[PDB]
Design a protein around this ligand. Sequence first.
Ligand SMILES: [Zn+2]
Lengths: 382, 437
Amino acid sequence: LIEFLKKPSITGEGIDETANYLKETVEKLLGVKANLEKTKGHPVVYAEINVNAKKTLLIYNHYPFSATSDNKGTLMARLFAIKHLLDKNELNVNVKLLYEGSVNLEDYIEKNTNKLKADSVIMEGAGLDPKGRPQIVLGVKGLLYVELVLDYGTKDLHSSNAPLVRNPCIDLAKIISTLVDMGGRVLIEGFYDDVRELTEEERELIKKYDIDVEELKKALGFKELKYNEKEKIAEALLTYPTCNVDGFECGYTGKGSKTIVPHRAFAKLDFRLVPNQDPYKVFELLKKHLQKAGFNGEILAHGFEYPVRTSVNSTVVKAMIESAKKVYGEPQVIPNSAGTQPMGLFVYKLGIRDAVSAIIKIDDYYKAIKHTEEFLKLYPIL
Amino acid sequence: MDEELYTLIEFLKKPSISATGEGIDETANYLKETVEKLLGVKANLEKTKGHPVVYAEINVNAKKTLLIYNHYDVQPVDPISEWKRAPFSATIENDRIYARGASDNKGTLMARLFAIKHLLDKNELNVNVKLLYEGEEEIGSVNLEDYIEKNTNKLKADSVIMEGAGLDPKGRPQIVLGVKGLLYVELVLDYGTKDLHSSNAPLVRNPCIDLAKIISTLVDMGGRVLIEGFYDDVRELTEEERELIKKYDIDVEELKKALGFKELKYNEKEKIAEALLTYPTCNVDGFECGYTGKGSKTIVPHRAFAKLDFRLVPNQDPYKVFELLKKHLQKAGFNGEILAHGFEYPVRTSVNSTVVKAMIESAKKVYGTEPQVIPNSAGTQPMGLFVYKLGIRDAVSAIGAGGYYSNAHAPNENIKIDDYYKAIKHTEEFLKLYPIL
Ligand SMILES: [Zn+2]
């Protein structure tokens, strides 16, 4: 881990060193041949461990620097566990290893669907959380990123000409204002039609979800939150889709005053999606809305990602919960994160029904190793 | 090269960007010294809360007194890369002088000075002249009123001429009988100490959207201002004023190409003239919030701000409009800071004053074409202070070393050397004629 931690692999600098090293390391520890696959994006490290087991599992990870947590240790911890089970011959599950708005990546998976078949899949991993209790996230919100651009002429005009032209700042401001109401509810027609109610189990988890409001509010730094009750906060943070403005720039915004009609304006939007919303469908709904709103400019989109919620009752989740309790001594389980990851690629392109994202202090790493071990042993028998 | 041209070049080589303050004090001192040299009277650097004012009186015991206003400060020159010649080289090429400030407003300032000199040298000056050169015109003349209010008796005059006006696209001299008023405003929202991961969006208000919603309430889609009471003080045009607008000569296609916008709101020339000269505005100069630049960064920004300028027409009071705006922002649930500056009054004066008449007739004699007379400029100038605070009703903006070709407020600003000489000439004829009418 220290050797893996020391090597840097950022801008695309010094990456091949870790890729070849990792390709060299998976073999030494597990004894199985490790493949390094070229791609339009960045190369992918792939390895397969077959114990002729009933169930097959997919493991997913991604490969100041003196080393004295972005998979800086989560990757190594899971590896030594499988190594520890291989030596004892107690391993009873097939394991495929895949090491990586995520615009690319999907291209690799689509051309290797048969190779990557598995009953369940485990994502990059989950941290220890503020409480120190093991945190298990059962999914992610989807994503749609959009940029809107208005360009009404070749140059800014002196503002004295304002009576003669349209101003793109006010135009784009008005467009943006039609997207949501005062309380943040999205006004795009059909936006909520695909949002499904929560299951009873999903509702139970949100109720059980323990957030300290005062600590959350303090850590955010905003003068005021829309909600004060912890139940309400959990519900909104994890269940509500959004239409958020990440950016808006137009005209002169430096010190003093330069009086003009700008010729160009743009704004960046991100939509957090929940099941069963489709980013491509939402994108179309947005375009229809913009047209009715008189939008006269350019639309650019990227980072289309699908939302995911994997049943807590599924054997892979049961295995993750019961194993954590044994090693950590209660695990905080949530139906999905507020954020977004390419979990949806493994559910809808590989058709892998059950996906979980769980399992730096030195004591945390060793725990992650044991937590991995206990899961790999309990999953086959569940 | 005669003294008229040489001195102008010398003047133009001195930077005097009021926005940064670069060269302001040197220029004011040179100008003071130059006034004394050329006219042989005492000139004074007078202090203000900001950049200094150059003042001088040329008394010839005449019955009439003229107050002449100009400004020695110039616009910034960034980006320097777009300039073919250094902004302050005052390079001569193609019988033109290339420098920031050539048109707005040093050429016109210096022409007038040399006209006065010529008349003095011939004992032909029959009007007392008071000179008032400020250094903050390009930054809204912030500290000019305070100076004027303490020197009202000293600045007494029967008439006033403002910074002046260049030749129109057809090359005809322009006579301008007023200005639109002005109110700069900055709105700021700050909801937290730092940007948040947009994944938190359901928990908080977003300042970008809130501010976008606020500015959206200010105007309808056509640009009409929705602030309650905004138009109440706006008075109808006089018959003469309506007449002048009808005569205002606009090449619509040449104008459209000059501006460079894909579309204009109007196609008829009279409608453009009306909108440009008669409509008050609520314009957004800027809106900044959250992440800008290449690629995607996902956040809830904690801060958003916008900059607005309101162009005003008679009888709107900028201080009143500010109050109306504030009442409006209350109702719209505005929750942030409001900062204002550059309060300027709109102005319109009579075409029938002798100073205007003297200006029309002199322009006609010197340029040999029909002067174009408009009731006010689309832009702003501190004419309001002279008319309302000093009580000088007879005010006009005319005489100009520059023209349509001049690229004022733009790179490669320049004036034709021949236009500089005609400007001196226009001023001479104006000064000979004003006292006899
Ligand atoms: Zn000027």
